[PDB]
Structures are given as C-alpha cells and as structure tokens.
Amino acid sequence: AFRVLKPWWDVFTDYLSVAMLMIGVFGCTLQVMQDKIICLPKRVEMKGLKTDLDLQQYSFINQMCYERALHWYAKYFPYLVLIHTLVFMLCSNFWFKFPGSSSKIEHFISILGKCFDSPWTTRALSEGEQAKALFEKVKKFRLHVEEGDILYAMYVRQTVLKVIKFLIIIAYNSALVSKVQFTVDCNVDIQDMTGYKNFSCNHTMAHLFSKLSFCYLCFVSIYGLTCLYTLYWLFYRSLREYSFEYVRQETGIDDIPDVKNDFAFMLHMIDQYDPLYSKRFAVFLSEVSENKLKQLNL
Amino acid sequence: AFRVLKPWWDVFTDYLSVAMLMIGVFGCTLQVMQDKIICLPKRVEMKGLKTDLDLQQYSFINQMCYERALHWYAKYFPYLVLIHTLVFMLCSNFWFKFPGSSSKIEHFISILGKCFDSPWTTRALDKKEGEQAKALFEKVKKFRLHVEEGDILYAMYVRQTVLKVIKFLIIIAYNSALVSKVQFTVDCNVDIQDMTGYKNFSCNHTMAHLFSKLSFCYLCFVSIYGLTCLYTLYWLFYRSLREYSFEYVRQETGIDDIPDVKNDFAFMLHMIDQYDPLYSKRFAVFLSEVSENKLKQLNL
Amino acid sequence: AFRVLKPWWDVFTDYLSVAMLMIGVFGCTLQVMQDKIICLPKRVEMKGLKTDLDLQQYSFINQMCYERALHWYAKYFPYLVLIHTLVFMLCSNFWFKFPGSSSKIEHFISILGKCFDSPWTTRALSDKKEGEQAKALFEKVKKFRLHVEEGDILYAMYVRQTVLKVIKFLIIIAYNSALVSKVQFTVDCNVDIQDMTGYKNFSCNHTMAHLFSKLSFCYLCFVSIYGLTCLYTLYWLFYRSLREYSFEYVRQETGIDDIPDVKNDFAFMLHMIDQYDPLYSKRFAVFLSEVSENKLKQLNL
Amino acid sequence: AFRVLKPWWDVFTDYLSVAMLMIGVFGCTLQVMQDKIICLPKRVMKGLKTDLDLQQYSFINQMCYERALHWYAKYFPYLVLIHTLVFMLCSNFWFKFPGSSSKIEHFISILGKCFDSPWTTRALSEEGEQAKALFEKVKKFRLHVEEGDILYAMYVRQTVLKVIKFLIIIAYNSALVSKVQFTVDCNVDIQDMTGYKNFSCNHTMAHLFSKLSFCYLCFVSIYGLTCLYTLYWLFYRSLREYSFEYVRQETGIDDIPDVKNDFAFMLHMIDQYDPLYSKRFAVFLSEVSENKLKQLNL
Amino acid sequence: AFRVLKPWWDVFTDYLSVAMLMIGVFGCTLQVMQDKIICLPKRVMKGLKTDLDLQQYSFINQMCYERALHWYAKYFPYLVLIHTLVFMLCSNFWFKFPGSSSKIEHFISILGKCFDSPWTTRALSDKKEGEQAKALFEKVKKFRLHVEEGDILYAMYVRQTVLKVIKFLIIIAYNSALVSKVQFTVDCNVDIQDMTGYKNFSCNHTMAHLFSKLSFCYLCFVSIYGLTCLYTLYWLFYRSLREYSFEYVRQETGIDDIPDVKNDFAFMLHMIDQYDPLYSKRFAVFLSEVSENKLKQLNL
Amino acid sequence: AFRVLKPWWDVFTDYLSVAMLMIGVFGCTLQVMQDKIICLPKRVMKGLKTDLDLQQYSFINQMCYERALHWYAKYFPYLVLIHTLVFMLCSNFWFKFPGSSSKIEHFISILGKCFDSPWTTRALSEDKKEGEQAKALFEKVKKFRLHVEEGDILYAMYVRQTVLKVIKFLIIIAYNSALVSKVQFTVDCNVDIQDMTGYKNFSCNHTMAHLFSKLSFCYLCFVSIYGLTCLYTLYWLFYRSLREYSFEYVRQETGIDDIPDVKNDFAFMLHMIDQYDPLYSKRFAVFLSEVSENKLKQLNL
C-alpha cells in the first residue's frame, strides 16, 4: 500500500499541503455568505442627507463599482490558493505513480517483505531451490533496474518544480499584497443614468483576506524551506556512491561492490527510513552463502 | 495496542483538547448565525426621531463601525481558539510519526506482546517454546545492541512538555490581558459627513455577552491543561528516569543476576508501569541466562 | 463487552442522560431559529398610534432590551442543560477509562468469560489435554486472585462518583426550583436612550416564554427520577458490607465445604456480577476448591 | 437478535408506531414552520386605514396567538411525539432489563444450538460426543428458570399499561377536539401602545389539525383493539401450563412431561412463529433418548 | 416465484395501480408547493386605489380560501392516494395472508416435482423414481383429501373481486359527480366590513386548469381498471369453474380411468392452466395404477 | 438474462428513450422553478405611474398566464414525459406478458445448457456421465420442440408493438411539429377585469419562451431518429419470411445432412438469437439430429 516510501519530507509536505487546502477552502466557503461592495455617492443642527436614489440604482452602483475599483487580487485570492495547493498536491504524488511504474511496487515491496521475515538470515550470518529462485529473481531485477534511463531528469525536475513554484508564489504574493485595502474610491462616469459621478466603496472582507494572505505566506515559506533542505541534501553530498567501510571491519567480507547511478540513489534514499533492509539485501549478495548452500546440497 | 503507551495524563489532555475543539467550533459557527454591530447616529407626548437616512446608508454605517470601533479580540476569538487547539493537537502527537524513532517503538511493543505466552514465567517465580524463548532472547539482545547511540527519546519529551507549558503561560497572559475589551455598547466616531450627514454613532455588538462566557470557559480549561502539564513535568524531574533496576524482583524472588538497564530503554520500560505492572515482571523473566541454562539442561 | 458490569439502575440512568441531552439540544436549536423579544414604546373612533420610528430603530430597541431586561436564566437555559448532561455522562464513565483501575476489570471479565465456557465446570458439577487446560486455568485464577485481593482501587471510586452525582442532583434541583418563576412572557424595559430613539419606556414580550417553562418542568421530572435512582444506589452500597463475599449457598447446593470467602476488592466485584445473574459466582467457585485440584491430580495419575 | 419473539400483534404494532412517529414529526414541522396566526383590529365603499406599523402587527399577532388559542391547538404534535415515545418504550422494557436479557440470550443460544443437532433426525428416524453433552445442558437448563414467573409477570405488567394509555389518549383526544377553530376573537388590553383593544384572529393551521386528529384517533383505536386482543390471548388460556400432546402421539415416545411456569409461557409465544420448535425441544426431555444413546455407546 | 399464480389481468391491474400512484403523488406535490389563492375587492385611464394594507390582503386571501373553494378542489390528490392504497391492499391479499398460503406452497411444490415425470415419455417412445413416485402419489392423495374440505381459495377471491368492482363503481360515480366544481374564478362573499371595509371579493384558484386534467386522467384510468375487473368477474361465472374435467386427456392419451376433481381444487387447477395449458396433463400423469400393477406383476 | 435477445435496434431505442425522459424531467423542473409570465397595462421624458398595488400585479400575472397563453407552451414537458413512459412501456411488453414469457424462459434455459457441451466438440471434429446428460438433453429438447413449434404467438406480439410504436411516432411528429410556432415571447392579453384593477388591456411576456422552443426542437429531432429506427425494424420483419428457419449453411459446412428445417415460433427465436453472435445456432443445431442420438446410444455401450 505504498507504505515504505514516505520520508519525513513527504509527510511534512503533505501536512503543509492539507493545511493550505483547509485554509483556502475556509476562505472560499466563507466568501459567499458575507461579501458586498456597499457604495454611497460622495458629494465633492446635524440632519440626514437624502440621496434620492431608487432601490435598483444602488444594486447597479454596487455591481458597477465591484469591477471598476477593486484589484483582481482582492476578489480571487481563495481561487489562487486552491489552484496552487492542488498543483502542489499533484506535483508531490507523481514520481512513484506514473505509467510504466505502478506495477513494479505492487510486488517488489512484497518480495522485500518476505526477504525481511526469512529466518534463514540468522543462520547465514553464522531450501536450496528457494534460495536459488530468490537469487536469480534478484539478479533479473538488478539487470532490469540498471538498464533504465530517463529517470534522473524527471525526478530532479520535480523538486526544482516545487522550488520555482515557491519562488514565483512568494514573488507575486509579496509584490501585490498592499492592494487589499478596506475603503477604495470608485469614479465611474454613469452620470445620466444615476446622477452622481464619484462614489466611495468599501469591501466587506478586506482585513480577514489580509490575515489569510499572511498565514498562507507563512505556510508557503515553511514549505519552501523544507524543499530547500531537500535540495541541499540531494546536491551537497553526491548520493550515487556507497561506502561499505563497516562491513569489512565487523564481518570481514571485503569484496562487496558499491553500486552507482540510479540504484545507488534509491539505496541511499531507503537508508533514511530503516537502516536494516540494506543488510538483509546484502545477505543475498555474498557468494560464500551460495557456496555453503551448494556444499550442503551435495 | 497504543492504549498501553498512554498514561492517564495523556487521556486527560485528550479529553480537554476535544472539549476545546468543540467550544471553539461552537463559537465559530455561532459567529455567522446572528446579526452584528447595529449603529445609529447620535445628536450630542414623546415623538419619534426622524433620522431620514436610506436603507443602504445604514448598512454602510454598520460595516464601517464594525471594523473601525470593535477591538480586534472581540472579532477573532473563535479563530484564535481553533488555531491554539489545533497546535495543541499537533504538539501531543509529534513523538510517534517522526521516522527514526517510531520503528523502535513498534519493535518494543512487538516484543512486549510476544513475551506473554510463556508458562515458564509463572513457575520461574517445551522444545518449541524453549526454542522460541531463545529466539526472543536473541531479539532482545539485538534490540539492546540497536538502541545504544541515538539518545533522543527522553530529552525531546521534556522539550515538548516545556513547549506546552510555555504556550499555556502565553495563552493565559494575553487572554487575561484582553478580556475587558469585549464590551456590549461602544462609541463609534468616524468621519463621514459628506455621505451620511452624521459624525458620531453609538452601537451594540450582538454576541458581546456570549463571548465573555466562552472566554471564561476556555480560560478555565486551558488553566487545568497547564496544571496537568506542570504535574507531568514535575514528575519527570524529581528523579532521573534514565536508570531502571529490577529491585522488587531481587527482594521478592532471589534471582539476583539480572542487570540494570539505562538510557532510552529504561525510560520507556519505566513508563510501561503506569498501565499494567506485570509486563515488567514478564520481561524480567526474559533477562537472565539461568533460565536458558535450565532449559538447555532439561532439553538433554 | 462493558454490559455485564452494569446493574439495572446503571442502564436506566444512561437512558435518562440521553433524554436530557435530547431536551437540551432541542431547546438550544429552537431558541436560535425562532424569532426573539419584540418591543414597542410606551406613553406612560379608535385610530392607530404613529410611533414614527425607522426600520432599524426597532432592531436597536429589540437588541438592547433583549439583554437589558431579561433574566439571565431565561436566556441560557439550554446551555445549562447541556453542560450538566455532559458532566453527568463524564461522571458515569470515569470508572472504565482511568489507567490503574481498568486493567483489573479486563482481567476479571476475561477470566469469567473463559470460566463460563470451559468444559471442566460442567464436568465437575455434573484425559490429559483437558487436565492440563484445567490446571492452567487454576494457575491463572490463583495469579489473578493474589494480584487483585487486598485492594480498594475499584471499590473506592464507585462511591466517589455516585456521591458526586448525588451532590450534582442536589445543587441542580435547588437552583432549578429556585429560579423557575423568573421566566415571564411580557416584561418591561427601562433604558436611557433618548437622543437616539426618542422613547425612554418600552414594553416587550419574549417569544419562547412558555415553552421554556414546559421544558423546565420536564427537566425537573427527569432529574428527580435520576436523583431517586442515585439515592437508591447510595443506600445499596452502604447499608451492608460489600467487601466480604460469602459462598454460602454454594456449599449447601454442592457439599464441597472447602471454598473460602474472599474479601476486599474481589468480593465487591463478585457482588457486582451477582446483580446480573446468580450463576457466574458458582461457575467461578468451581475453580477455587482444593478438592477440585486433588481430584484433577487423581485423574491425571 | 430478537426475531423469534415477534408475534403478529407485536409486528403489526411496530408499523403503527412508526406511522405515528411520521405523522407527529410532520405535524410538528408544519406547526413550527408556517405562520402562526393573523389578526386585524375590529371597529365595533372604501378601504380602512389601520395606520399601524409593520411591527405593531407582529406584536399584536403573537400576543393574540399566545393569549387566545386553546392549549390543545398549539401543542398538538408534541403530545403525539410524547405518546409515541411512551408506547415505543413500553415495547423495549422486555429485552434490555438485565434480569430478563440473560434468560432470553441463554434461551436463544440453546435454540440455535438445537437447530443444528443431527440427533433430532436420528431420534425421529428410529456431533457425536458433543451431542451427549447437550442433554446435560438442557437438563441444567430447567434449573435456573425454577425461581418464579419473572419472565411472565413482567410481560403482563406492560400490556395493561399500554391499554390504559390508549384509553387515556381516547379520552383526552375526544374531549378537547371541538376547541380547535378557525376564526377566534382576541380581546387583550394593549391600548396605549397600539391604539386598538379588540382584534379578530384567524388560526392558519386550524383546518389541517382536524384531519390529523381524526387520523390519529383512528390509529390509536386500531392500536387499542390489537392490544385488547393480545390481552385476551394472554388471559383466556393457561399460559403457565403447556402440554406436549402432539409430539408423543406423533413419534410414539409417550413419556415426555408437561412443563409449567416459564417454559409453558415461552413455548406459548415461540410456537406462534413456526410450530416446529416445540417438537425439536421435546426430544431432549425424555430419558428414553439418553438410555438409547448409552446402549449404543456400549 | 409467485408469478405462476398471476394471470395477465393481475399484472395489468398492478400497472394501472402504479400509474394511479404516480399521478396522485405528482398532484400532491404540486398542491403542496404551488397552491395559493388571490382575492381583490369588487366595486359594483388610471389605476384604482384599493387602499388596503399588506396584512389585510393576507387576511382576505386566507379567509376566502376556506369559504369559496369546494372541498373537492382543495384536496383532490389525497383521495387519489387513498384509493390507490386501498387498491394495493385489496390486491394480493390472499398471497401474504398468514394463513391460506401453505395450501398454495404445497401445490407449487407438487407441481414442481410432477413436472419432471418421465413415465409417459419413456413408455410412448434409478432408485430415486421408485421412492419419489410413491411419495408423490401419497402426497397427491392426501392433498386431494385435504383440499376437498371447503372453500378457502375460491371464496376469498370472489369476495375481493366483487369488493373491487363495488369500490370502482363508487369511486367513478362520485368522481364524475364533482368534476365540475373545480372552477378558476369564484366569488367569495364573506362578512367582514368593520375590519376590511369591502363585502364582495373575487378570487382565482391557481391550479384550476390543472386539477381538471389530472381528474380526467384519473377517471380514465379508473374506468379501464374497472373494465378489467368486470371482465375478470364475468369470467368466473359464465364458464362455471366449480368442477374440473380431465376430458381431452382421456381421448388424446388413452388412459380411461382419470376421475374428475371438483369443489376447491377445481378452481385452483382451472387457474394454473392459464399460465400454461400443458401442466394439466402432466399432473394427470400421476393418476395411473400402472406402477403398482407392474410391481405386482414382478411379484408374480 | 434478456441481453442476447436484444438486437442493436432495442438498445439504441432504450438510450433514446432515456434521453427523452431526462430532457422532459429537466423541462418540468424548469417549469416549476423559474418565474413566469409578467404583465404590464397597455395604454392604447418621464416615467409612468400605474398606481397599481403589489397584489393587483400578482392578480394580473396569474390571470393572463392561463387566459392568454396557448396550451402547448403551458404543458409541453408533461406531454413529453407521458410519451416517453408509453414508449418505454411498449418495447418491453411481450417480455412481461403471461403466456409468452414461459416459452422465452424455456428457450433461453435450453440454449444456455446446450451451448457448452462436450458432445458439440466431439461432433464438430469431423463417457457414460456425459452419455446420460446428453440423452437427457436430447429427450427434453425433443419434448420442447413439440411445445413451441405449434403456435404463432412469439411472432404476433413483436409485429403488433412495432406497428403501435410507428403509429405513435407518426402522430407525434405530426402534432408536435404542427403546434410549435405558438410558443412566442410577447403576447397580448385582453381580459375584462376593469372594475377590480382599473385597466383592461395588458401586454405580457413568457419567461421560459425561447428555451421551450429549443428543447422542443431537440425532442422533435430525437423522436424523428426513434421513428427512423422503428421504421427500419418494421421493414426487417416484412421482407424475410420469418416463420421458417433453414439450416443450410450449417448443413454445408458441418456435413451432418439430417438437420430438419424447423418453423413457426421456434424459427423466430433462431432468427433473432443470431443477431447477438452467430454461433448459438450451430450449438443448438447439433442437438437436433437422429444421427447424433444414434451415435450417442452406440457410445453409451
């Protein structure tokens, strides 16, 4: 059930994504119950002032000044956040699920699991046909993995995609954010139809939108910091080579090869979840075990 | 399963957290279920006063006085309580799903569950079970070999507890500071004279009495939550929990050869005692070579 | 399940609590949806009176008088119902999910369930594997008995929760009978709003006036029944010693005059099970006699 | 779980109960939804100007609503819900009482175990070790019920309550049905606030509650008839004594006894679902079967 | 299945019943959500100032509602629903009756077991048949003896058919009688002059041109249903079905010993042939003494 | 179940009926939801004051609605719904008709049992249990032949319902096409209510006018397609003599030259079944030869 491929980066990013989704949906849903653009005509003891306007010349004015005096950011922010969070969700579900790759994990994980629970590992540390079948299947899988190209470009283009998305999001959410004020001026030229040429209008939900924008900025910043740390881990230290320095010291087997390229990256990434499957895999790589099994067979 | 690794204080906190969530959501939903600030102009047998204003100049005045007179606390109280209860939720589960320290807990609980079907334990104080006993001995040996380098299962507990207590202090601070600004009647003095004709307005915030009661309830709940957290923190510090010793076994049975474990394993093993003080004995039986030697002698 | 361990009064009270929750939520929902206080000014061939007020001054007057003239009880009645119901529900369940007093309940239930199903019980009261199973059951019984005997962590909590429930009964009946009469239909409202409305004296009426009186009467009835139940339980616990159980009838009906009388924690638990059906006690009595073990040994060899 | 103890009366009354619940909830919904009442001033071709505001109408309207209508015309649905709840409660005071749930559960378990016993087929024609054990379980079965008619008197102590409840319903729904009128006169003293002392009001939902009242009366009438039939059924014949008249003359084993008290009553109900259970139960009650099994074993 | 016992008229009636239900429910919902009445005074270019307020119009509307509209117009759909419900109840009453159903189930089982008789086929050109055959003979004999005891499946059927005919008659009569009292414009002459000022009013019922059409459609369906029931009733009598004669079986089979069953079983057998006019002879197969004759001959 | 016995012109038709039902229901919802006719008085830069109240306008709207509009514009969707329901009733009639469904059930059952039989494979090349099963099959199909190949009922009903559907399509495409120019926007209401509402000459406008024209056009096109399909099906039955089947190609390509030419209803079933997939005819044909019976009986011994 895809339970083995989930580092702390993935769970943290998914939590940030669901937080973004909930904040965006809260903003959107509570955007049709109370949002108006109530406008009155400016007049460029105390008594009331009569505007002499009908009950439709106010609806006219409201909806005319809702699209001539309000910045496009103040009316579509929830839509932007929902769209971008959905894009992030689709982005961070694409590597381990795309055509030609779903089938592998359905049974490779089961093979690894039955490799983990085999009790013969303890005896090996100090049945012939089953071991032979397992070893030949492992060899076939190894040959299959090393022969596949077009695998680094796609994945390396995933995290950077999130990084560039971060850059653009923070860019245009920091640039145009001071245009969500609470009292705007509308100056349409509807003179004959109503009578007044200058009006004052005030968006109902401006301050709450500003607070939501700040919260979304904070969440995006944390998400981008996580992505930057991911890149730093990927780039700072090359992840295409392994160092078997402990094995020759604690076991004496000093002939274990160090894999490179894509397979080395996969092994290293698996190293951050549970540093025990590697030894189980290595047990089915030494030749001494096969020699002992062959001798026992005779 | 997980209930075993759960002292009483972390069921008390769970109940309080769910109560906080329910009160916060009730406040938030009651927010948009009733009208809001209502304002009229001020003029500073009986016959009414003809204000002479339209039906939209009243909505204008209402929404201007709303975000020009009311204090910021009276408007976002439910949102604050939702945020705080959610962060508390996240603060009570951030020591179970962090990779690198969750698998070890799974291994320990699996070992605890396995060491239950052993009739030799009762007689301590056949062939298959004995071999399974040796297998469990190897399991615990390699587990103790494993847990010897990463000593983060007790310090981070202290860190999260101090985080919770600090958050409790700040919550109390600014909720006691700003509880007198949730007033019913307010004075709204904005400058709109060329659009309505009046300069001074008086108003009534609608849910200005229910929020006081909700604030008092939330304050009391967070107070008891802080008390529970303080009690747990004090319990954790009046003696060092990184050292365990099967002293009662020594004084009650006479098998005085079991060793005293320390560091991370001692911590969780001591913590198990708050749910069922028998698994400690069952593990104690599986911490001595005398049982293995006797079983091997009985085998031949 | 947690059903055998509930005398007849402990299941009736749960139904009563659910009913109180229902009445409280019904009242709370009815309050918000329906309209509220309506007010008019007062001036102290038939033609009407032109008050001349606007359409918002009426909302202003209503909203001011609503909480400047109404008694505090008439407004928050359902909320008290919900808080009291939640407190009662917590009180009646603070016996199972408290570590240090719940594992023993699980052991007791498991042991009794296994005993009621094992064949040695009927085989005793009318080869090798069966004997071994019976011996294992005997060992488990001995271990659990020596573990749980000499304790008061399961009988010194039931009393506390019941006394707390009775105290809450007394408090709630007290202040619910005291303040019932302060819910009225038509009330006066005198406030000093002269430069904004023009009228200083108002007469108002509360929309949900009588319905709350009827709900309050139903609440008194339900809570009174609840308190009668709790009082009966309080009498039952204390009128005689619950911590020393005697297997009297067992010896006469079976004749094995060697079953001891257990006391303290275990005896109270046996009493609690006895209220469900007087059978579990005897079937457990089967695994408590030395003669049973001796005849099991004789069968073994 | 309680399907066997569902005689025809008990299954026919459940549908009446659910119908009453539906009618009550529908009536309450309409009563709380639609406009309560409408009133105008009285002056005891041109229009008459009342001069009243749009709020004084509401004040007069609700004051007259709650000062003129008879209490039966207002709280009609609530009475229906209360009475439906009481009747529903009286039909579940039989399975949840701890002193009777145990016996019922034990009896149903015994019935289930006996339903798949090949020994019945063996006996009628002329598993293994377990079949013999069932004889002792049945023999010990007629020991825990030898303590009194606790499962019988409690059934009789609820049908009487239901019948008296139905009588009460008929009385208080026939006596006070002529007080639901359409046009009523409201005379209240609000003179200095409104200007009119005499009003006439038209209860909107007055010509609908009559038909609901008639339907409710018919339903409770049928309910009372069914309850009376069940009472006569339980009282005319000796429920406390049952006879295996048919079984002995059917199979030839003329030694099965006639049990009384709880067994007679429980068998009197159970045979009304499928008259084959008594026959199967009668097999495990004669020493002939046990003696024959013993002889077969030796 | 129960379809074997349902001739064509049964399914046709059920289809008509569901059609009546759908039309009734449509009428009911439209009455709920679209029925209202509007009234103005009468005064027995520029508009006319009635001068009435906005509550006096509601008073007049709901006073003239239940003073001019004839009761048939007010509640048409409820009568349709009740009549459809009683038609449904009248139908299939002897199919789900607590009694008088084992006599049907036994016949169904006997027919199912008698369908697969191979004697006639194998004679005109293995232990199961010997016991099965004799069991079938004995069961058929006992069933004939029991069914020849009275009227339990012939009386109820005739009674329900005549009841349905009578109810159809009354429904059509009283639905045709009042079809002309659904009018669009009605005169509401009430006496309220000291509170409204006008004595004569004229009102429009919203759904008047609609209830007429639904009424006519319902009347047509009722007429068709009654015609079908009348035909079925006529079928009962003019061809007497109180006796069954295995006539053609004798000539076109040659087995000249088959008796004739009458009274209760005659109607049931006459009814079972309608689904398929072949099962009669198949049942008649199990009436020959040839099996025991061959057994006796073997005994020789 | 009845899936093999359904040529393409009985699933195309079902889809068309579903579409018509959906469009009718949508039209009904629109009718019951949106607003309706709105009228203003006629007088045959300042605004005109009509002095009419807020209820006289409702009166006028509700009177002109059904004193000025044509009946088709008012009740289009209900006609659509009735016609769709009757169409669906017609095509699925003979399946539920007693006296003609038992034969269908027997035929489908027998054809299913004999579709997969080893004797087929053994016969198309050029066991006692298989032997007994085969002979039972031969006998029951033989007695089934004389049960169906006597009447003409399975060919009568189909023709009648297709004729009825074609007639209904004719009448639909006739009047629904004729009465569609009367659904217009602006009408002229001339009721005589003067002593009540002052004015006498009114102008109105239907709200859902053009949309009821476009939906009517869509329905007309769909029913035209339905009629074309039904016409094709009707032609299908009136050119091929369907009262006889001839195993000619099977006889030539199998070599078993004793298969008889069956007729009457059974021929109709054989003709209609092949429209699903032309192999069941072969599998049924092989179990119709006395040669096959002779070979079976020879193989039994």
Curated annotation (Swiss-Prot), chain C:
Q: Please report any disulfide bonds recorded for this protein chain, giving both cysteine positions.
A: 39-204, 65-189
- For side Extracellular, which residue ranges? 181-210
TM spans (from-to): 8-32, 75-94, 159-180, 211-235
List where in the cell it is found: Cell membrane; Endoplasmic reticulum membrane
Subunit description? Heterohexamer; oligomerizes with other LRRC8 proteins (LRRC8A, LRRC8B, LRRC8D and/or LRRC8E) to form a heterohexamer. Homoheptamer; inactive, likely because it is not targeted to the plasma membrane in the absence of LRRC8A. In vivo, the subunit composition may depend primarily on expression levels, and heterooligomeric channels containing various proportions of the different LRRC8 proteins may coexist.
Q: What is known of its domains?
A: The volume-regulated anion channel (VRAC) channel forms a trimer of dimers, with symmetry mismatch between the pore-forming domain and the cytosolic LRR repeats, a topology similar to gap junction proteins. The cytoplasmic N-terminus preceding the first transmembrane (residues 1-22) regulates volume-regulated anion channel (VRAC) conductance, ion permeability and inactivation gating.
Q: What is this protein called?
A: Volume-regulated anion channel subunit LRRC8C
UniProt organism field: Homo sapiens (Human)
UniProtKB/Swiss-Prot annotation, chain D:
The cysteines covalently paired via disulfide bonds are 39-201, 64-186
Family stated for the protein in its record: Belongs to the LRRC8 family.
Taxon lineage: Eukaryota, Metazoa, Chordata, Craniata, Vertebrata
Gene that encodes the chain: LRRC8C
Q: Identify the species of origin.
A: Homo sapiens
Which stretches are transmembrane?
8-32, 74-93, 156-177, 208-232
Q: Does the keyword Heme apply?
A: no
Q: What does this protein do?
A: Non-essential component of the volume-regulated anion channel (VRAC, also named VSOAC channel), an anion channel required to maintain a constant cell volume in response to extracellular or intracellular osmotic changes. The VRAC channel conducts iodide better than chloride and can also conduct organic osmolytes like taurine. Plays a redundant role in the efflux of amino acids, such as aspartate and glutamate, in response to osmotic stress.
Classify the source by domain of life.
Answer: Eukaryota
A GO term (biological process) for this protein? fat cell differentiation
Cell compartments where the protein resides: Cell membrane; Endoplasmic reticulum membrane
- Which protein, by its recorded name, is this? Volume-regulated anion channel subunit LRRC8C
Q: Which GO terms describe its molecular function?
A: volume-sensitive anion channel activity
Q: Which disease is it linked to?
A: Telangiectasia, impaired intellectual development, microcephaly, metaphyseal dysplasia, eye abnormalities, and short stature: An autosomal dominant, pleiotropic disorder characterized by variable features that include telangiectasia, gastrointestinal vascular dysplasia, intellectual disability, skeletal dysplasia with fragile bones, short stature, and eye abnormalities. Patients exhibit striking cutis marmorata in infancy.
Q: Which residues lie on this side of the membrane: Extracellular?
A: 178-207
Swiss-Prot record, chain F:
Domain of life of the source: Eukaryota
Resulting phenotype, residue 29 to C? Alters channel anion selectivity
Subcellular location(s) per record: Cell membrane; Endoplasmic reticulum membrane
Q: Which residues cross the membrane?
A: 8-32, 74-93, 159-180, 211-235
Q: What is known of its domains?
A: The volume-regulated anion channel (VRAC) channel forms a trimer of dimers, with symmetry mismatch between the pore-forming domain and the cytosolic LRR repeats, a topology similar to gap junction proteins.
Describe the protein's quaternary organization and the partners it interacts with: Heterohexamer; oligomerizes with other LRRC8 proteins (LRRC8A, LRRC8B, LRRC8D and/or LRRC8E) to form a heterohexamer. Homoheptamer; inactive, likely because it is not targeted to the plasma membrane in the absence of LRRC8A. In vivo, the subunit composition may depend primarily on expression levels, and heterooligomeric channels containing various proportions of the different LRRC8 proteins may coexist.
Q: In which tissues is it expressed?
A: Expressed at highest levels in skeletal muscle, and at moderate levels in heart, lung and peripheral blood leukocytes.
* Positions of disulphide bridges: 39-204, 64-189
What is the protein's known function?
Non-essential component of the volume-regulated anion channel (VRAC, also named VSOAC channel), an anion channel required to maintain a constant cell volume in response to extracellular or intracellular osmotic changes. The VRAC channel conducts iodide better than chloride and can also conduct organic osmolytes like taurine. Plays a redundant role in the efflux of amino acids, such as aspartate and glutamate, in response to osmotic stress.
Similarity comment: family membership = Belongs to the LRRC8 family.
| All ranges on the Extracellular side of the membrane | 181-210
Which protein, by its recorded name, is this?
Volume-regulated anion channel subunit LRRC8C
Q: What is the species listed in this Swiss-Prot or TrEMBL entry? A: Homo sapiens
Q: Which residues form a coiled coil?
A: none
